[PDB]
Design a protein around this ligand. Structure first.
Ligand SMILES: Nc1ncnc2c1ncn2[C@@H]1O[C@H](COP(=O)(O)OP(=O)(O)NP(=O)(O)O)[C@@H](O)[C@H]1O
Ligand SMILES: Nc1ncnc2c1ncn2[C@@H]1O[C@H](COP(=O)(O)OP(=O)(O)NP(=O)(O)O)[C@@H](O)[C@H]1O
Ligand SMILES: CCCc1cc(=O)oc2c(C(=O)N3CCCc4ccccc43)c(OC)cc(OC)c12
Ligand SMILES: CCCc1cc(=O)oc2c(C(=O)N3CCCc4ccccc43)c(OC)cc(OC)c12
Ligand SMILES: [Mg+2]
Ligand SMILES: [Mg+2]
Lengths: 388, 388
């Protein structure tokens, strides 16, 4: 093989399609136990088979909608629609639209720039301490690139215009945006047909729909001051506590006793629930409405506090050595937090790596919370084991 | 703020410096328990404070050296040198050098292309099933970008020339390469001065040196047929088993009994050691000489087999319910494997996401191995707990 065939240069766009895993995660099927929202049983834990990259291009658009609550605190509503037969997904939000005007540096309409060109963002100035999930300027373009059809509609009353542009064929084709006069209430609606051939799928099947549906419930629980609709029906979730209830309200421990769930809203930026786990350490956590499915420093930050205080309680009774990992093994923690300018080791944002001193806020759990944590059955499970 | 200040486009190079976490990991200090190789005690587990991105730019160059064993099976040696006082790190390997000739498409010398331009690689053709660690065409440029001085020396007898080019100031400055006549044994030497200001460090301190040193021992253990030298001394590690010995050969369980370590080289591509853990699940694993420090499907693939067989043994004696996570909680597994065209969710390659059916090989552990695994004290720990 010649030098020119062995050593190759790729464009950014080529690289995304060649190496999708670092941008959206695996484009191959994955089977694992997790929580989804099914049509027949609602929230439940089961084996699910899905393609991570498909989940993630949906998630990018969903989190972008959530992020608009930080641009416009008056935003009230996100609407999610999924139609497997037509293969059409739409995510709509109110609050301020996107400026329908030509960017004077880039010489294109602002929505065309930030949905149709890589590395474009309103989150590149870190002197502003934002609790948006958006950080890198890729998400929306990644969804576009993995869609056969990708449509952006937005209306910005400030500029008195609406904007509609459609891309097709993995962001490789587009056409002149339709601009009109607009004097109503702002909105943005992203409508896309995912390119199922990129994920070796024939249709949006029940498992991927159940996962996408659960993310809508996640958002109802995590995104304060925003109501969520799914396929035309408002979700009956109002606050993180009611969201946590979907997991633990009807649940018993192995001895037949209802799980005791304890909650502290430490401040506006930190909501924490804790209960007993009997299947090893479990965490459900959100940073700026991103599901941090590998955890991160925010999880460790909260859990370490609990583990420390519970070792004190067990030590007042362990009259041998109780190790942190044994305590952590009995914890099921739920965390909803807002972190200033978070960092992650991947675009998929499963693991939040920002150190706590940089969070912009603290979550020091009260002594009342710790007293309750010492009574939710975690201490008893440990003390029962101190005998063996 | 105006449209042009709010909505910004970045170049690829700008984005790497603005958002380093997705390319090299956190540029902030991290403190955690882990294994390093210290000057006074050798291999040990302790709290270590280091900057992940600094570790990773070193690792990129080290794995690139390991990868050359796949270009030239005759390669025998990698030499690592770290001088904290001068701030100079050098990684040298023999076997075939890099072609010292002008790339006819890109119109630059091949080494200048693949060390000085983003998205350049010999690993972009996946029709070839390679067990290199290199996949994305970033690594070497990332080290260059986070170095104040970055030098590439290579000699390719086939082309009868040597090549030397130096970059400076985060890959923003360079000068004409020095080409000479060469008729000796090929080599590549990468020498760099990391830009410690990017990591808020004054010097290569003991902790980062101990971690970098351990990676050299990792490579001696993981990279078959390649001897490793560190600061002028060959490392006394010959094969994965002798490497594993550095962790467990002198170790006792909590009852004062030496850890029983069991080993199977299933085939050329899979080497597996297993022993008892008393601090929850532990894994040390390598894919194509990358330290997979978050694990991946290769870890689950091996562990699931063990967990399945051990539940059978415990069930022949558990005359209640022993759950997989409880068995996994007593396992310390060591894995060295070669995976065809692996995937990862990040450039840092901590988590290998390729599904096992795509590995290019299998690791079905023998019945002899499983019999031994049922006697290394994992079953006894479980059975002891079945009483409580
Ligand atoms: N629903 C929306 N309403 C208003 N602005 C939006 C909306 N969706 C996207 N945007 C804007 O479009 C930009 C590009 O989105 P995106 O490509 O996801 O980048 P990002 O969110 O800034 N960072 P990331 O998601 O980490 O890659 C964002 O920075 C926002 O300014
Ligand atoms: N020591 C070396 N000997 C020979 N070729 C090398 C060496 N180091 C780097 N290269 C070549 O330089 C190219 C660029 O290296 P790099 O930028 O690390 O990309 P990569 O290894 O292919 N992929 P990645 O490490 O996943 O970003 C490699 O693909 C190799 O062809
Ligand atoms: C590649 C996508 C992985 C993934 C995606 C997802 O959406 O959820 C997950 C959950 C999961 O169901 N949830 C429930 C609410 C959201 C959440 C937040 C943090 C942790 C877990 C969860 C999960 O629970 C074992 C495990 C998961 O992967 C290991 C995933
Ligand atoms: C951001 C870099 C993280 C990291 C880097 C590293 O180099 O090592 C690690 C080890 C670690 O020391 N080793 C020993 C041989 C290499 C290896 C392979 C897989 C798993 C662990 C290990 C570790 O052991 C708890 C934990 C680690 O991070 C959570 C890291
Ligand atoms: Mg985004
Ligand atoms: Mg490389």
């Amino acid at each position: 093989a010649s030098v020119e065939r062995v050593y190759q240069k790729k464009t950014q766009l080529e690289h995304i399609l060649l190496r999708p895993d670092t941008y959206i995660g695996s484009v191959e099927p994955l089977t694992q136990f997790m929580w989804v929202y099914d049509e027949d049983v609602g929230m439940n834990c089961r084996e699910v088979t899905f393609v991570p990259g498909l989940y993630k291009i949906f998630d990018e658009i969903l989190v972008n909608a959530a992020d608009n609550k930080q641009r416009d605190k008056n935003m009230t509503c996100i609407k999610v629609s999924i139609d497997p037969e037509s293969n059409i997904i739409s995510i709509w939000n109110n609050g301020k639209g996107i400026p329908v005007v030509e960017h004077k540096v880039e010489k294109v309409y602002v929505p065309a720039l930030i949905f149709g060109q890589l590395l474009t963002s309103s989150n590149y100035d870190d002197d502003e301490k934002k609790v948006t999930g958006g950080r890198n300027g890729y998400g929306a373009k990644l969804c576009n690139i993995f869609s056969t059809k990708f449509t952006v509609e937005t209306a910005c009353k400030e500029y008195k215009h609406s904007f509609k542009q459609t891309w097709m064929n993995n962001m490789m084709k587009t056409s002149e945006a339709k601009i009109k006069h607009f004097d109503g209430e702002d909105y943005t609606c992203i409508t896309f047909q995912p390119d199922l051939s990129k994920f070796k799928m024939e249709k949006l099947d029940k498992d991927i729909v159940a996962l996408m549906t659960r993310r809508a419930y996640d958002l109802a629980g995590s995104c304060r001051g925003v109501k969520v609709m799914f396929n035309g029906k408002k979700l009956p979730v109002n606050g993180f506590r009611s969201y946590v209830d979907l997991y633990v309200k009807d649940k018993l421990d192995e001895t037949g006793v209802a799980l005791k769930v304890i909650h502290e809203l430490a401040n506006e930026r930190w909501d924490v629930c804790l209960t007993l786990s009997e299947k090893g350490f479990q965490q459900i956590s959100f940073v700026n409405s991103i599901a941090t499915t590998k955890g991160g420093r925010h999880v460790d930050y909260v859990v370490d506090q609990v583990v420390g205080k519970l070792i004190e309680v067990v030590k007042k009774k362990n009259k041998v050595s109780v190790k942190p990992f044994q305590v952590k093994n009995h914890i099921w923690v739920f965390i909803n937090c807002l972190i200033e300018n978070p960092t992650f080791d991947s675009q998929t944002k499963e693991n939040m790596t920002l150190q706590p001193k940089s969070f912009g806020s603290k979550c020091q759990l009260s002594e009342k919370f710790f007293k309750a944590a010492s009574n939710c059955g975690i201490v008893e499970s440990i003390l029962n084991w101190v005998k063996f």
